[PDB]
UniProtKB/TrEMBL annotation:
Molecular-function annotations in GO: transferase activity
Record's keyword terms, sorted: Transferase
UniProt protein name: Sulfotransferase oxamniquine resistance protein
Length: 252
């Protein structure tokens, strides 16, 4: 197909929750558009200064005139990106739809129990889980402090629309997961939505986006809980990111 000059603006809004293939999608979108895609990894590795901006945004977003102030902040944060995935953005998908009226919406989904088990190993271990101590240690090596965890928890609460949330309760999380995914499919016009099951790969995505399947490039498969466990252990061992970054080429 012909090469065309794509606009550097948000073209794709992904509503999928963490641990649903969002980093693979981020990588795939960057392969298609040759511009960056937002993801929690963007905050952790490139823009930790964004953390307080997202926290402020979530704080203001329970609240027209104040709507515009928030929408402007949302635009500032996403400037120069061509897509959004993952926390903290995914909870804002309805607002992003208004701000970027020509952007299409994706929903990444998977088996709810596989999701919960992935989440527990990586994002939200039970507070009695000894692994949680390793996660906290690896996080410190990356320079992630209490404000990062606050942003993580608050943006999940915001996505699930729940003033508080027993994070140690599987049944609660499973119910929020199903309800969240259900509400996305109800809220977004089917013309504007593509639902992607883990493992679907390039074809339905590229069709939806009217682009050619990348030549000879397999659809990304990254950010497994096994890989994140290795990253955590390596961070603990070497006490820096830069010491090991060459060992995780596509992941980061
Ligand atoms: N192309 C692909 N095919 C199958 N699973 C994939 C995949 N890309 C990512 N995943 C899975 O999606 C999860 C990561 O999602 P996210 O990037 O949103 O955190 C991981 O699940 P597991 O932890 O169960 O291995 C990872 O294995
Ligand atoms: C030791 C290091 C690997 N820990 C970082 C971890 C794993 C990556 C990660 C990803 C997300 C969302 O994709 C969130 N989140 O939901 O805020 C938190 C974290 N925290």
């Amino acid at each position: 197909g012909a090469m065309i000059e794509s606009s550097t603006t948000i073209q794709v809004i992904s509503a999928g929750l963490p641990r649903t293939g969002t980093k693979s999608l981020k990588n795939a979108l960057e392969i298609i558009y040759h511009k960056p895609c937002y993801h929690m990894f963007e905050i952790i590795f490139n823009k930790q200064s964004d953390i307080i901006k997202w926290q402020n945004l979530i704080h203001d977003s329970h609240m027209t005139t104040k709507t515009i102030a928030i929408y402007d902040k949302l635009k500032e944060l996403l400037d120069g990106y061509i897509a959004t995935t993952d926390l903290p953005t995914c909870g804002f998908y309805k607002d992003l739809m208004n701000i970027y009226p020509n952007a299409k919406v994706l929903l990444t989904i998977r088996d709810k129990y596989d999701w919960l088990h992935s989440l527990r190993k990586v994002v939200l271990p039970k507070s009695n889980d000894p692994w949680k101590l390793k996660i906290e240690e690896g996080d410190k090596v990356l320079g992630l402090n209490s404000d990062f965890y606050k942003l993580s928890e608050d943006s999940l609460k915001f996505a699930f629309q729940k003033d508080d949330l027993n994070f140690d309760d599987d049944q609660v999380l499973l119910e929020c997961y199903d309800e969240y995914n259900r509400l996305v499919q109800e809220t977004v016009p089917s013309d504007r939505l593509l639902v992607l099951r883990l493992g679907d790969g390039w074809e339905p995505l590229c069709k939806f986006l009217n682009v050619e399947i990348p030549n000879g490039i397999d659809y990304p498969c990254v950010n497994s809980h096994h890989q994140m466990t290795q990253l955590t252990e390596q961070l603990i061992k070497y006490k820096s990111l830069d010491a090991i970054i060459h060992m995780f080429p596509d992941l980061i």
